[PDB]
Amino acid sequence: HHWGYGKHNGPEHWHKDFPIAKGERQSPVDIDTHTAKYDPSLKPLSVSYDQATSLRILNNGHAFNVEFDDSQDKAVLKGGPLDGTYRLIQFHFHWGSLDGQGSEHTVDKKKYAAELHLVHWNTKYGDFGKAVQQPDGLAVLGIFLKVGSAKPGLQKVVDVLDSIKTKGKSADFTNFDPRGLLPESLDYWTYPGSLTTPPLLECVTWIVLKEPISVSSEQVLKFRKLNFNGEGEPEELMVDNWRPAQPLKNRQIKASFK
Ligand SMILES: NS(=O)(=O)c1ccc(NC(=O)CN2C(=O)NC3(CCCCCC3)C2=O)cc1
Numbered sequence: 001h002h003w004g005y006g007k008h009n010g011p012e013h014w015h016k017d018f019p020i021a022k023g024e025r026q027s028p029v030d031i032d033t034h035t036a037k038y039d040p041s042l043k044p045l046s047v048s049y050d051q052a053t054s055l056r057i058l059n060n061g062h063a064f065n066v067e068f069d070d071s072q073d074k075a076v077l078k079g080g081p082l083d084g085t086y087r088l089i090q091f092h093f094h095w096g097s098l099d100g101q102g103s104e105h106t107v108d109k110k111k112y113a114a115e116l117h118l119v120h121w122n123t124k125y126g127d128f129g130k131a132v133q134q135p136d137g138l139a140v141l142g143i144f145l146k147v148g149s150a151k152p153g154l155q156k157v158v159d160v161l162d163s164i165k166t167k168g169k170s171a172d173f174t175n176f177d178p179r180g181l182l183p184e185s186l187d188y189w190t191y192p193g194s195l196t197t198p199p200l201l202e203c204v205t206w207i208v209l210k211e212p213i214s215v216s217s218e219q220v221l222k223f224r225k226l227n228f229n230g231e232g233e234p235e236e237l238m239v240d241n242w243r244p245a246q247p248l249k250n251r252q253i254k255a256s257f258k
């Protein structure tokens with residue numbers, strides 16, 4: 001596939017190779033804070049990252065992924081809307097060319113500067129490849145980024161980006177603690193949706209935190225120096241790697257909080 005975020009290969013083209021792009025539970029969506037309803041049936045959200053084992057950072061030509069050892073139950077997400085145990089396998093971000101855009105989800109049509117996706121797969125399906133074939137296969141924890149004060153726990157990510165500037169470059173990224181990327185509050189919205197990149201599989205329980213994290217202008221400027229292209233190819237800055245809001249269709253967004 002040759003999908004990306006340009007005029008010629010961007011989100012409006014994706015449906016030709018990935019017809020589910022026009023499906024019934026696509027992501028991201030706008031979160032209308034007034035029509036999202038408090039659900040008392042939601043159990044407490046459990047983010048258990050104490051034993052998280054990061055291994056590597058990869059520039060995959062669409063974003064950069066911090067990859068985890070998911071060979072055991074070391075870093076898991078449970079509770080909230082979730083049945084059973086979801087294992088952390090990677091995180092990445094989507095971000096803008098300028099501070100006024102970059103998030104995939106929106107909140108009353110507001111766009112944040114960036115959005116962090118912590119990707120977990122349901123352990124009842126045994127591996128990630130099997131889990132993406134199921135409607136409850138994945139849980140993605142989405143966290144908004146606004147530009148303000150630096151996020152101390154982000155800086156180790158920022159400082160390695162120089163070593164993975166281009167598509168296909170990776171670097172060792174051991175002993176990174178993803179708990180440093182969380183906000184104080186775990187208040188969330190949740191809805192059923194999809195991967196936000198091809199293959200756009202309708203396999204995700206979305207859990208979007210209400211409280212954004214603050215990152216510095218200097219931190220997000222370093223995200224924007226990455227390249228979509230490979231080494232020795234024409235430089236295309238890795239910016240505006242976000243899919244816009246998709247139709248909500250027959251879905252309800254539920255709030256964990258009143
Ligand atoms: N924007 S999104 O909705 O959160 C979204 C979330 C996940 C995906 N897709 C994947 O994670 C597919 N995939 C990678 O890219 N890396 C792998 C994980 C790292 C461990 C080694 C296996 C490879 C993997 O399984 C696409 C969109």
Ligand SMILES: [Zn+2]
Nearest residue numbers: 092094117196
């Ligand atoms: Zn994502």
